[PDB]
Symmetry: D2
Subunit: 250 residues, 4 copies
Amino acid sequence: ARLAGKVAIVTGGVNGIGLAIANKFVEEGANVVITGSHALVGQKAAASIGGVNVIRFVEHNASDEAGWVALFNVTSAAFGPVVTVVDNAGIAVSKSTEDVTTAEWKSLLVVNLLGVFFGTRNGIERMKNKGLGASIINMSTIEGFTGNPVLGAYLASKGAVRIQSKSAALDSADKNYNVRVDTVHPGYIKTPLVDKAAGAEESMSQRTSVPMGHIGTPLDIAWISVYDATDESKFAVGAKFVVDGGYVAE
Amino acid sequence: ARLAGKVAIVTGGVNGIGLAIANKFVEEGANVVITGSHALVGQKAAASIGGVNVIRFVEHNASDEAGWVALFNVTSAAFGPVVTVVDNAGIAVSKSTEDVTTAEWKSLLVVNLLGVFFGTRNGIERMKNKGLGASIINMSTIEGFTGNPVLGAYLASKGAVRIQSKSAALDSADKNYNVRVDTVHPGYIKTPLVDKAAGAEESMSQRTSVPMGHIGTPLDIAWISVYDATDESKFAVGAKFVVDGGYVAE
Amino acid sequence: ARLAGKVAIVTGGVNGIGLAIANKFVEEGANVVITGSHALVGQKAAASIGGVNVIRFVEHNASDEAGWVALFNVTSAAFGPVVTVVDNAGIAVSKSTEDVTTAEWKSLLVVNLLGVFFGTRNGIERMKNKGLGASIINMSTIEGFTGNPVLGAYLASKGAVRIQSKSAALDSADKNYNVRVDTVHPGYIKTPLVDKAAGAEESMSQRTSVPMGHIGTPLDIAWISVYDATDESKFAVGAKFVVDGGYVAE
Amino acid sequence: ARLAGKVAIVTGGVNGIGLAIANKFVEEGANVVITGSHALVGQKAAASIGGVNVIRFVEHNASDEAGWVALFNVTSAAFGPVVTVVDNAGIAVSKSTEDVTTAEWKSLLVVNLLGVFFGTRNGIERMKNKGLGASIINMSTIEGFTGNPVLGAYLASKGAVRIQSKSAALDSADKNYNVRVDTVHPGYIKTPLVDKAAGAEESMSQRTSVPMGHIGTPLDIAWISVYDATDESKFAVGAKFVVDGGYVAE
């Protein structure tokens, strides 16, 4: 019951970290809408967690600005006023800054940065001043703190989310909106996508990368997001929550 | 049951933040030893939370190096192997660096820095390699991130705890000790000590200090410490967890 | 002679910080191209510093991707191979995240983020592997470290520049390109634009904003950029250089 | 002439980084006192740079509190009022937190932390309110930002110097003392001590440690310290200046 009465939107909620967030949110009493681009993936994901009284899928691309107000409307029609937004949808491009095409740059930033902007802006407007204990959780990354030579556009996007979220936190705090905004910074997490890239988990598990010598699992990110969605974290805003196996500590 | 089977030492556990940590640790199933300098304060504190099957007081000054191994022995005799150490004992001096006497400097660092060192070193030695899911939670502060012109020695101590904790985290991770080390960074928290200082809460609540316009409460720190003591945070090590009402975000 | 033989592009070099960078670069022996949107402003600016053997103006919008390779060509035709790129062009929008229009968001990011990307990508390609001691200096801000509730899009842009620059630094270092990339983070700086906003300098000079009690001047940013362009800083890459009167230290 | 009229104390100025700071300070017009523990090393060091009109050695242990006021007196008798203090003396212990003896802990902190405190406190008292453009440069390290599992006490000391320096910066700024305080954070630097440790330079030069693939040289730290001692950096206070070959950027 740590999220009793909460109503959450989790973007990119049909896979990996987003799916585990959705799963533990439902376990703790939240009602959840998960979004993703692919209907078969999303419908399967939602039903794996529960029935439509607690979780529903909505097909939505986080870069689709017009779809964001309709996503809030669909969620509110199902479950009542939204209290919690998890901006987790994202894509990755394996290119250095030098090698990034302008098309790749714009495509990644449209999801990773504009999508987080759209969800954060709308979340503040739709959740402020309602006594909801509202919480916006923006998914950055260890790549919001440190560079990676082969993730130039992804670093830009995660650095932007990191500091934009502080602006939003501050405005919400100063205006007594009853909205908190924080960032979560996963390290490497094992998912079916990582499993599809031969050698990725072993590269990520080297001690010079992750000092724990292994990578995490989606629930590792789900539990910090439960804390941040809950009223337990009512004094936490504008902060960065790193769950990375020690990556950024060295 | 989030701390089912855990056995915690909370230094400075008889007042304020430490007491609330102890309270919520017991609520989540931990057995707890709280320390403090003053027997009447400590005995009252322990009994306010529960009986001696779940919480006991031990009189101990965290600067007392010889008492630290005996504190572990007393805790283990009561409750079995220690899994969780919260290094929360600390003192404050209201002096600029310019105005700090060497006596004040040494007194504060003996508790705030040497005491955390003693608890962290001993905690690693006594908890490693036992499959306990062990966790060391070192209390830094917002004063581990930003200066305050009137808290020079306190800033030194909190900066030291911040980075020493990363060293310990890394060594524990690299050696597969099954010990995590993290820091918690409270902002301003309302306690009876703050209530005794006329005008302190209002100063701390100005928007140029805490953007939320009010200060926190001890449970705000207790709940992040429950997360960090629990196996929910098994991939979090070497990281800084800030709960400050937005103080450091501007 | 600290920049003997260097050839620099300074975007947004016709006003304020960029102009002072250009001025001190010429003083230290560099040849400089300054860019800006407005021909009369740019021509006056260039001639205020020196003749066309040491400084020239090129009209260019940093968001104009096709103009960037022509800007390098014009600079190289004048002065020989470019060694130094200062990505300083930028705009500001005074809006919270909540109040930012999508048009404002896209307009600011096209200059502040895409323009820095275009200059950094091209700079690496055109300066690598030539033994030039090449240096890319990306202008972030104190708003790359801390939020401001009324600068949401500007914070996003400066956070992105901060971390994208680390990616570029690392790739250049790992590949032995002989290119360094660093960020400069000015605090508040007095310029004619600040002088045009009634009350801005006094707001910025309050001790709760800038602890020095006054704001800086353009040369304060020029001298850190001379250090970073010079071979004196040959071991500095991927780092953040803050010149802010103490703003971020509290 | 970048340090025309400055009078500097450089602790640990007889070797390595401190010696190079002293050398470039003299080159830029400063008068310098270098300290060290060993008379033959110090006398040779001073004469290698210049005669006693510009540089003198004083034998002093930075942990020797009573010697610090006499060191200022000796410097002022030689050269007039001190303007610049570089707190560079330090020692290292290769131990994890777990393996650090209390004797090792106290010995290292007495030099690395108490010595910096003594020089910073005295520097503020002796240089404030004199129109000197005074500057205190505290030597932290990359180990003030990130942990190293084998440098536990050294990390504590460098984290403490990092944040204590911000307190001092702020107090000096707020009181209009005309004293700035900043930290410098070297990465790995080649010195005769590093050359005496078989395999150290190669370990430090691995790309997973220093992305540039080599370590720095003492002059790399000297030139950032010239910038910080000079009036060029009159708006820089409370900040961290990292010169590390990219170490902390990944």
